[PDB]
Amino acid sequence: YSKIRIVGKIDVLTGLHIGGGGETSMIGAIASPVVRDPYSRLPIIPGSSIKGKMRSLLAKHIGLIPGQKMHNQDAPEILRLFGSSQKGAIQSSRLQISDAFFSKASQEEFDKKDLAYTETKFENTISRLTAVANPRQIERVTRGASFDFHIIYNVENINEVMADFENIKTAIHLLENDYLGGGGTRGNGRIRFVIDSIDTVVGDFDSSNL
């Protein structure tokens, strides 16, 4: 059994907004706060949000079956990688995608020039009925920000490792051309992946070609 560690950077090409919960809002304050690491108050990218977006894009690329009801009806590669919960056909997820935290390098860069980690984007919605704008404030992680992402791959079937990493590269290529987080169709969440390394932390597996 082997575990392959993929550590890298996610660079915010356009402002990133992933929702946050449990905070009531002051009148005139941000309508939509982002998810933040409560200990550090810095924004983070939830591992689930990347895994869900990556899996959704990869599944759309592979092709969904007609009238697919559940996530467990995906292609065998998608279930092999991200996991399945079919009754009597449970497959362990090979991809454990952890939460991406605001990097200390970007922390230093934003402490220089006295730049806030997040920025409030003021928006409105002009109605099709009365043509009256309805303002909102969306918090978004700044464009300069970088997040340290850490993924683990579980080497269960060696013969499928190369195909699984090909699918991972396809999914990440889709995600770079897609967005992450919410509001992406209106310019939010565009990202770039920079793979610092693909190490093997567990086992004797040779991962230099991945």
Binding site: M26, I27, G28
Partner: protein
């Protein structure tokens, strides 16, 4: 803190003061104060509130104290420009409470002042 005639400053007093000023005519608050001037003052206090919110230390830093001083300056300027803003500021004692917040010099008192301001805005919206 407290007002003249020994009344207590709280969100209950925010509701009470928005109600006593409220005059039927259209609903007129503080002799012609409009929602827009109230939202401008709320924008000022919101900038200061964001400054303090981002911070975690209870003691108010020097920059937010200067922000409160400039808030008092803006209060005076808006009072001079518009009679209704002057009436609102003197009836709700917002600048006096800015002085009180500066005297106390803690995050709790500034957050309570922000809550009082927000309650004034909310009840002004409700009673219109």
């Amino acid at each position: 803190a407290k007002t003249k005639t020994g009344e207590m400053i709280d969100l209950n007093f925010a509701r009470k003061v928005v109600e006593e000023n409220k005059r039927v005519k259209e609903i007129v608050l503080f002799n012609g104060l409009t929602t827009s001037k109230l939202r401008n003052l709320l924008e000022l206090i919101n900038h200061v509130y964001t400054k303090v919110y981002n911070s975690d230390d209870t003691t108010l830093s020097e920059d937010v104290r200067d922000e409160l001083e400039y808030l008092k300056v803006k209060f005076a300027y808006e009072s001079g420009r518009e009679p209704a803003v002057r009436t609102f500021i003197e009836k709700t004692y917002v600048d006096k409470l800015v002085d009180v917040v500066l005297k106390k010099n803690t995050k709790k008192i500034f957050l309570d002042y922000c809550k009082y301001f927000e309650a004034l805005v909310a009840y002004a919206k409700f009673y219109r």
